[PDB]
Amino acid sequence: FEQWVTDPVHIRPIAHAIWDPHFGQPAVEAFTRGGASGPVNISTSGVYQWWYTIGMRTNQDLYVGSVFLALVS
Amino acid sequence: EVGPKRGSLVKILRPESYWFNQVGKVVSVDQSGVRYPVVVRFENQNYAGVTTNNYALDEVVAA
Amino acid sequence: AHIVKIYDTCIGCTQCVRACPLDVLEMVPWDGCKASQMASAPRTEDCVGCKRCETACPTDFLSVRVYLGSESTRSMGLSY
Amino acid sequence: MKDFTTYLSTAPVIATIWFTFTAGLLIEINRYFPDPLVF
Amino acid sequence: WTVPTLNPDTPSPIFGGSTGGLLRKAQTEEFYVITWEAKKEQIFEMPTGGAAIMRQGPNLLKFGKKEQCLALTTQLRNKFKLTPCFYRVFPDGKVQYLHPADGVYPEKVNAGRVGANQNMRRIGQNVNPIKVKFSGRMMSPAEI
Amino acid sequence: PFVPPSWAPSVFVPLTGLVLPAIAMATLFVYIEKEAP
Amino acid sequence: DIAGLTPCSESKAYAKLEKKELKTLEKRLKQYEADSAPAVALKATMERTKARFANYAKAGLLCGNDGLPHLIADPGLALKYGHAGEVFIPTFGFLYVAGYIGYVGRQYLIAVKGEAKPTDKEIIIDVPLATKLAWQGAGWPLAAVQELQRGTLLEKEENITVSPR
Amino acid sequence: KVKIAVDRNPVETSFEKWAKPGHFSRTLSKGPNTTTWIWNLHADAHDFDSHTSDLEEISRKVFSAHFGQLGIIFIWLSGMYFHGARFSNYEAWLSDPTHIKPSAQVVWPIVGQEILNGDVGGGFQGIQITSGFFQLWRASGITSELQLYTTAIGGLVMAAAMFFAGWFHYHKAAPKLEWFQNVESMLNHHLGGLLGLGSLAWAGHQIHVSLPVNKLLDAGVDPKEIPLPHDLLLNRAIMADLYPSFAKGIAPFFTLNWSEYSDFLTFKGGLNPVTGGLWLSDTAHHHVAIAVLFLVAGHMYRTNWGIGHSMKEILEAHRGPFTGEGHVGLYEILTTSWHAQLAINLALFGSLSIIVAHHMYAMPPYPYLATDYGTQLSLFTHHTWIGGFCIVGAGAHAAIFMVRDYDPTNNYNNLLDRVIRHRDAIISHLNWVCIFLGFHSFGLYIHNDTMSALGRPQDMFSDTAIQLQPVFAQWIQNTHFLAPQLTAPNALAATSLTWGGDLVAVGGKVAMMPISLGTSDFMVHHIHAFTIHVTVLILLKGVLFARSSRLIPDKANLGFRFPCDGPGRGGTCQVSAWDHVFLGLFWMYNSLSIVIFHFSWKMQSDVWGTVTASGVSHITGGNFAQSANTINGWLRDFLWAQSSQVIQSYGSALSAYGLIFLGAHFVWAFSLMFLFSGRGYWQELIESIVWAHNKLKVAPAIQPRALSITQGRAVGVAHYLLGGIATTWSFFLARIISVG
């Protein structure tokens, strides 16, 4: 998120990391992207543009919100 | 001799009847005190293929 | 067990009793129809829900009605 | 002959004849008035 | 007429056996035993599959469910004009006579029989489900 | 900030999707097979 | 003209499509001798193609950027801009034929209903009666209005069956 | 005593019944009251058994119905020969068969449909045919449209004779039951006359017409200057020049000097290098041997003399310690039940139609048939489909017999009775075999798909990764290939090039070459085993449980075709033997769809292809071996890649295949409406529509009714097979004609 905000036109949003022990070394490389950091899935939900539009700018902001909503649940 | 005349055409009034608002012919009316004494015959068969049914005097009206 | 019910529209044709493949019905003396007999359902616990009785019923609407209910080894017609 | 004409009056026969007539009529029209898109 | 007693040592029709016979239910829950008298040895069809020869005089067979017994009862009565009777047998030795319950086949009206599950109304006179709602359990307007 | 360690997935993914399912299935199957007193 | 469309007569795409179509037919007409039956057939298709492109343009059809004729279905735009032979007139032509079939069939069913075995007259068609009604169907529209005004076209609800409700 | 017995003037020839629809049925003759009557009339039209309980009357109806079929087939053949004489490019194709495409259907120029008249060659424009008639006519030695026209007229004379025979043997001289029950006599005539005489006569035509005419055609002689067949039949010197042994006449035959006829009766094997088809001399010696073999076979059954065998005696004699009474009762069942005969005949005839597809493709019997890939693919697929349908029909009529003609009094402790007594063992064991095949066949494809997606190709089942080689089939191929030198010394070459050896090329295209079998072949052969085993499971179960089951003990009383026994016992939907045939059709379609797809890809990938300088280029470049081991491989490299021809056919002569391709996808989806729905919903919807018709006084006397449950199932399966098979048909023909 802190990299997508810098270049939202060319950076692909990451949904979450992929931990699959059935993967082969080629699959690990094919799914490694979005600043590398290991195999990850790109997000098509639109939360990156949404949170960015509403003022979210840092992972600290995202972390705090997560805690709040967990408390609300 | 209670009931409609034999051979007369009457319209069914029983709501759950296949011939509701339809006209049939009075085959016979049982003078004995049966719950449904009017035997009516219809040209169109029902979903079961039956073309006759018994109705009470109130369930039938000349039409 | 399935709920089997007989209605006053019964004409005492006995067709349902002859069609039943599990002996759930029988004919009992009656005074409401010319046949002086009406169908009864004293063994519904053996009913499976085939609805053959309803197929045999010639009245409009049906005088015998089957309502599928709680399922048992007999209701599911299980030989195991 | 009367029974034969009754057989020729049966639903399928009449349908074949009527549809053959209607198809033919439409085909001939497009044969003499080709590519009819508008009135 | 009196309730008949099932003689379990009755001769069984000649049959080499099949794979459609009784299962573990016969030993844990219950099984059914049909009995009839034959005036002549006649080959017949086992409702469980296969041909079998009925023996002269007494005959006894065991089926897994009541429907199989009544199915054989239908064939013997309709084709051979015989009059069979069947019972439900529990694994504790208890026997329960089932058909004909009063010795008179159900289709033939018989005295003493008391009506059951009969409604003094036509189906079109049943109440709307809204009336039988919030009762002890799921029920139909017909049950009331 | 509220960041789990790198081994998190190496442990969380195994537990959630294999171990926990087995535990859940075990207790659930027992309850269904249990009969009313 | 309307919707930003352009007359097929002035569309360049319409002209290119006609050339493209004739060039396919010509590339094939070559492999055959001049009088060969194949050659005669390809020539008649080329003539029919030329007549179609010309007839469509003369009819004043409008063409989109695809160079294909588009049909105007608004009664107002069609009448004011000369496009009524595209959907309006066809509509009244079909409605007349379709009502013709319906009114004749209804007249047949009503006639056979008063017979001994209506079901028999539906599997075996009373041809003479059917032909008579077929010819008398030309004036169906006026007959349908006269039935609508006498209250004989519809059935009384009291005589029509319905479910319990 | 075997003898001709008939009844005179049994049925009057009047149109009285023609005007009384449903006259044949006691229930239908009353006339229609609802729309169900119309369907019932057509559905019960050819069910004579249900019409009458008289076997003699049923047998007479069957005999005349067969003459009607034979007349229909003759008209069909006359049309094909007529269209070859008046609407075809056969004479031009005879001169240039390697370039001109066979065409025998020309369309009228209307609504722009003339585009379908493609440039097939030879100065002709029409639809390209794939029936293989041009190659059959060339093999027969036809060189003129006059011969095709004369055969067409002959076929119509034969069709008129067949229809006459049908009317005569039903209304004038109807054979009695005893006549039809002469099975021993029928087999003797069908083996000796129909088969042996038919083969002998054909050998006559081949030796006196097919061999010299085709030898001259292969030598390069123009079809116009070839001697007419009669010239060869009335002159021995011409035949002697072409075949020296003809100068000796028929002396060598009666003197047992058969070796002299070695020039026309041969055992070459392999393929004619000029045409790519089997040697006609080999086909001639074959039909002569077939004729002799079948003439002997037709002298085995006893008739009106003591010599011969009694089928009842033979059957009653074959009994063993494990099978009780044995084949007792079968003679009575197969002489009093047509459904029993139809079951066995449909089973073998379908299995045969499938065997013809494999044998005709591997050993191409007609000249220039092998390099015509459109015709080759069409023939194999067509005969494969006919076989599968007949096999499913065999199942249905076996169940019809079990439900209507089975009598326990005649089947006590016999093979039939003992089979019904262990039906649960049979179905349960077959059930497990089906589950084992499914996992070990389709599970392998899933493993490969997952391993490839996970980027682990070394963990896949392939000719480069883990290998599953069909060793047994590889050994058989090697044995058949080396056969000529050891086990078949006289034969010059092996029966087919598929076994191995050198490839035969005609017109620059591969006629036939060796077909290699690897892991992908091993995997698809096991899918076939699974699909066939499962289809058998459904059909067999439907037949063995047709009379009764643990769920329903009186299924036989309910009949063969019945919707269910109600929602009781949990639900008894589709318990009838007819419903098993309904389900069997879907699996038969699934099996054969996979079989024909396998054939098309394998042939386009490893056999068919242009032969160039130092190398053969196949149509798909040999991608079957490395692309047919995954479902993704099948979907991408077969369906998606080869659908390009049908999807890009618009604006051309194959445009019809594109339209049919879409129309077929439509019919298939339209079937799902009937297959997933129930009549209860439709009946109610019709009720509201009927209301509108009642309101406007336009309601029909014949009450509209939703289709019966069984009709709903029958309509659904019909549209499913029609749509699905037609879709493959359009895909196959467009693809093959374009890249042929």
Ligand code: CLA
């Ligand atoms: C059935 C749906 C439908 C729809 C969506 C339209 C839509 C339209 N119609 Mg219309 N029309 C219809 C049915 C319909 N029509 C029918 C059944 C008839 C037969 C009588 C007509 C006869 C008709 C005429 C005579 C005219 C239109 C016109 C128009 C356009 C402007 C009309 C307007 O202002 O509001 C929409 C109209 C309706 C919702 C119903 C009918 C149209 C009204 C009655 C016409 C009033 C137009 C008015 C003068 C506004 C335009 C001013 C000026 C440019 C003429 C418009 C796009 C006008 C036009 O653009 O001509 C160039 C025009 O004058 N229509």
Ligand code: CLA
């Ligand atoms: C006399 C014939 C006739 C007439 C006058 C009508 C009239 C009507 N039908 Mg209808 N219908 C008919 C026959 C007829 N139908 C037949 C044979 C069928 C079986 C397919 C149906 C099935 C049918 C359905 C499913 C529906 C209607 C509906 C309707 C109503 C809406 C308008 C409409 O036509 O929708 C379209 C109707 C059709 C597309 C059916 C086409 C039937 C053909 C074209 C008629 C031919 C009749 C006969 C062969 C001619 C005999 C002539 C005689 C001289 C021998 C309307 C009042 C709709 C409705 O209820 O709306 C309220 C509706 O949903 N009909």
Ligand code: CLA
């Ligand atoms: C003018 C000659 C003639 C006449 C007047 C009759 C008259 C009669 N025949 Mg008959 N018959 C004839 C010729 C004739 N037949 C011939 C040539 C054959 C040999 C095939 C038969 C074989 C035959 C049999 C086996 C039976 C009769 C029966 C009957 C009687 C009632 C059945 C009937 O005809 O209804 C009319 C029936 C039809 C009009 C159906 C036509 C069948 C044709 C051949 C099917 C054509 C299908 C087509 C090729 C493909 C359709 C595909 C689709 C897409 C369009 C009746 C009195 C039946 C009987 O005795 O009464 C119980 C009986 O079982 N006939």
Ligand code: CLA
């Ligand atoms: C040499 C003796 C002979 C021959 C050649 C045939 C040939 C045939 N029989 Mg057959 N049959 C025979 C003796 C013979 N039969 C005897 C002795 C009996 C009594 C036991 C029967 C009883 C019998 C029955 C019950 C049936 C047949 C049927 C058939 C046909 C099956 C269709 C087929 O596969 O062939 C393909 C078709 C052809 C090759 C067309 C050529 C057929 C021509 C006409 C050859 C002539 C055959 C005929 C017997 C010759 C005498 C005709 C004369 C009376 C005018 C077939 C043409 C079936 C049928 O219905 O046929 C209508 C059938 O059901 N036959």
Ligand code: CLA
């Ligand atoms: C159905 C199979 C068949 C048929 C029809 C023929 C037919 C023929 N073969 Mg042949 N052949 C066959 C199979 C057949 N073959 C096979 C399988 C082989 C491989 C062994 C051969 C190998 C072979 C050779 C090597 C030769 C022939 C030859 C011939 C021709 C001369 C036969 C002959 O010499 O006298 C045969 C005797 C008769 C045919 C008896 C005739 C009886 C007549 C027709 C009865 C008329 C009666 C009537 C009442 C008269 C009144 C008439 C009326 C106007 C009043 C002849 C047309 C010879 C040939 O080609 O000649 C050029 C020859 O060289 N064949």
Ligand code: CLA
């Ligand atoms: C020699 C082959 C043969 C013969 C002689 C018979 C004979 C018979 N079969 Mg049978 N059958 C066969 C093969 C054969 N079958 C095969 C291969 C199958 C597997 C699919 C079946 C499956 C089958 C079933 C499931 C049933 C029969 C039944 C019957 C009996 C009544 C037939 C009937 O219902 O009439 C009427 C025939 C029709 C109404 C024809 C329907 C139209 C067809 C199916 C449409 C096919 C598509 C068509 C080509 C589309 C054309 C294009 C379109 C646009 C028009 C009859 C004695 C029935 C029976 O035994 O009664 C209990 C029955 O239920 N057959």
Ligand SMILES: CC1=C(/C=C/C(C)=C/C=C/C(C)=C/C=C\C=C(C)\C=C\C=C(C)\C=C\C2=C(C)C[C@@H](O)CC2(C)C)C(C)(C)CCC1
């Ligand atoms: C007489 C006849 C029959 C008809 C019977 C009956 C009762 C038909 C019922 C008609 C009814 C109730 C119609 C009700 C409302 C109709 C309305 C509001 C009309 C809508 C038409 C509109 C808005 C026009 C649209 C356009 C026009 C100007 C024409 C075209 O340009 C196309 C378009 C859409 C632009 C039987 C028996 C079916 C048998 C047969 C002959």
Ligand code: SF4
């Ligand atoms: S549903 Fe079946 S078992 Fe129950 S009463 Fe009716 S016929 Fe008997």
Ligand code: SF4
């Ligand atoms: S079938 Fe109906 S009317 Fe007849 S006895 Fe049974 S319940 Fe009564």
Ligand code: SF4
């Ligand atoms: S859903 Fe249809 S087929 Fe199944 S039990 Fe009910 S009525 Fe019979």
